[PDB]
Amino acid sequence: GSSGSSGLGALYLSMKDPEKGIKELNLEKDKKVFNHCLTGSGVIDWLVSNKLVRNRQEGLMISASLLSEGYLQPAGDLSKNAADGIAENPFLDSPDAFYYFPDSGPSSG
């Protein structure tokens, strides 16, 4: 959805930019590496970093909108369990939660 979702789209399109957008590091958990992944909080960090909102909170909400649409895929836990049907907020402003775009993500190999 690049022609729809007025706002998110554009925003997302940016997130793709590894320079003018969100970064991409390799995080771990237990015993699993995750390449081309982000962070629940980080995702918002880029938002605040660029000043997409007034505070982290705002981002927390927006973030959801991003994830919801499917611009951010859950990887690991929490985020998933959330997307499942936790509350009215699928996103989790936590450094533990991790997300990735449906195109890159942790490439097998």
Task: Note the topology.
Elements: H1 8-16, E1 25-28, E2 33-37, H2 40-50, H3 56-69, E3 73-74, H4 79-85, E4 99-100
Helix pairs in contact: 2-3
GO biological process, one term: negative regulation of thrombin-activated receptor signaling pathway
Function: Major protein kinase C substrate of platelets.
Keywords: Acetylation, Phosphoprotein, Repeat
Record keyword descriptors for this entry.
monomer, 109 residues, alpha+beta, Arc Repressor Mutant, subunit A, two-stranded antiparallel ribbon, two-stranded antiparallel sheet, 4 helices, 12% strand, globular, signaling protein, pleckstrin, RIKEN Structural Genomics/Proteomics Initiative
